[PDB]
Design a protein around this ligand. Structure first.
Ligand code: ADP
Ligand code: ADP
Ligand code: MG
Ligand code: MG
Lengths: 328, 328
């Protein structure tokens, strides 16, 4: 009786890590194959159940209801890509503690490819296939990619130059298409190959964690975005926003990830979109004209951290967006 | 009775892949903890033993003689770094079929770090520690990084620009310090953090495979090189060469990896160094002034492809280099 999309919410518990494996480390998450339910168990102060649009069990290979990367795409990813081609603005963000599997989910591995390349691959096949199915229609892909870190935005695709003075982009406002980053490089991409190249580039340009030997900063959020324009004399374009958020564990190096929580809170139970760069840039995706999905990633061992992730996810089911179809 | 270093040869069999795992896929490699022996078994035309400087069993976690990434470094990597700081030119190359674990070994994972970052970390700790142990001495690190692909050399650290006309560097010859790449960017690096940044950049700049969704070209060789200069009014520099070769399976897109074989062959049982770009640039690491290691990577399932890798590794034991200590 009103037109609002609910934020699609989905959880994915990952497999034990060698570190934990070592410890005969306990597992405190259970997902029902049938009901889409996730249960936080009590390790040997209480047991909690939740229901989500999907509860992805990616914790044990040999389980009957195991959820592969392909299976995650096939549920969430693909359907959202449909919406994009039907001219919706899409947005999927991975949220959860560091090491919960946000990056694995979104990006995955060379031979374990996650949401993003999946989408890319899917996308281009469609375009290719929509040649002789619909020859008076044709497509046009640009990709852009940036991370926020310490309330600073940097263009992950921009060339980088030794004796580095790291260079930050400005955030400004389309009176019609929301907030955006002033001057972010957007790169026309003709194929999978080309796209997944710029993906790889941008990626190795992220902030390096100094805590691991060899990692991306656990406190950097990254936004990969595919703008997709369909031309028929007349054309319209949708934009695919795909986000790998900074870990959630219990300018300021924090502001963004914490005030994000404040937003989701506002939108369920003045939304403080502008109290942070990330939330301001995603203002539209979290309540503007966006078909939007949250993927709560959870560790199978961490009790309070998982309980938090879950609480948010639960709270985020209540958010409603005003998702439309674009045209010019 | 003559001063030649033997090429150090080492092999590492990796764990099954999920794909193989699926198949109850057979395992045909066996390493003796005690003797450094590797045996190619007969699947259920013959059984073949070999001995190497080390035979790394990285195929099953719960095994008593399992070889971690850390343990691979602690054998090969460290000793070699020692040689570097003593002023030797080092070079370690990974060789084997695609998917054998070359990249995993050399580079590894964010939380599975291989040879390279390990080396970088070790290196910088030494320098840090050699502050107040030896304050009249101090160090100076530059990193450079390039891949060869289709007999083309490209500067993986050079900035890259949209509407990309991919840009190839030239090969010219130091009448004194061998072959080298004319104008390759070398980047002074002040810390672990700085170096492993530039590693990540260069990396995401490699050629994209179009066979996988999301991968580096199985046919690109990458040469990561750390030039380390020790200053005392007087200084000298050694260079660490770390190589992730193109796979070995059954300008021309092949020339390099195949004529490499022809070289190793020449040096054991006119060495055709210049018949390819790769072998010409490594001319020096393969028989010049270089302490040098080969790491043969092998799949635990692939019979002929492993037998070939092994054949070469066996043959490479015979190579002797003319490894010195440098000074100016
Ligand atoms: N769903 C999964 N199943 C098995 N292993 C996983 C899964 N997700 C992540 N991993 C592994 O766990 C580690 C942490 O994953 P990562 O995606 O970096 O977490 P985060 O992005 O939250 O830091 C990585 O080694 C990753 O490969
Ligand atoms: N030693 C190992 N133990 C367990 N898994 C491995 C090992 N080496 C490689 N793998 C996995 O096998 C796959 C192929 O490894 P990779 O290094 O890419 O081989 P190559 O570089 O020869 O293509 C990767 O997913 C890698 O993470
Ligand atoms: Mg991550
Ligand atoms: Mg590789």
């Amino acid at each position: 009786k009103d037109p609002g999309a609910n934020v699609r919410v989905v959880v994915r518990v990952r497999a034990f890590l060698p570190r934990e494996l070592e410890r005969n480390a306990e597992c405190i998450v259970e997902m029902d194959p049938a009901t889409e339910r996730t249960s936080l168990l009590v390790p040997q102060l209480e047991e909690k159940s939740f229901t989500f649009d999907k509860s992805f069990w990616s914790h044990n290979t040999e389980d009957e209801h195991y959820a592969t990367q392909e299976h995650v795409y096939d549920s969430l990813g693909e359907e959202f890509l449909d919406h994009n081609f039907e001219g919706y603005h899409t947005c999927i963000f991975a949220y959860g503690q560091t090491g919960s599997g946000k990056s694995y989910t979104m990006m995955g591995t060379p031979d374990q490819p996650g949401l993003i390349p999946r989408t890319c691959e899917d996308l281009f096949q469609r375009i290719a296939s929509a040649q002789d199915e619909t020859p008076n229609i044709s497509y046009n892909v640009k990709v852009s990619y940036f991370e926020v870190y310490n309330e600073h935005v940097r263009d992950l695709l921009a060339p980088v130059v030794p004796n580095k003075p790291p260079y930050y982009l400005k955030v400004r406002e389309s009176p019609t298409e929301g907030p955006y980053v002033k001057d972010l490089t957007e790169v026309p991409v003709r194929g999978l190959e080309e796209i997944i190249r710029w993906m790889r580039i941008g990626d190795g340009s992220r902030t390096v964690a100094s805590t691991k030997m060899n990692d991306t900063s656990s406190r950097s959020h990254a936004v990969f975005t595919i703008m997709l324009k369909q031309i028929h004399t007349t054309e319209r374009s949708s934009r695919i926003r795909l986000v790998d958020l900074a870990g959630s564990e219990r300018s300021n190096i924090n502001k963004s990830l914490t005030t994000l929580g404040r937003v989701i809170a506002a939108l369920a139970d003045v939304v403080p979109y502008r109290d942070s760069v990330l939330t301001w840039l995603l203002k539209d995706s979290l309540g503007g004209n966006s078909k939007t999905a949250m993927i709560a990633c959870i560790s199978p061992t961490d009790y309070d951290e998982t309980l938090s992730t879950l609480r948010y996810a639960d709270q985020a089911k209540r958010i409603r967006t005003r998702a439309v179809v674009n045209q010019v």
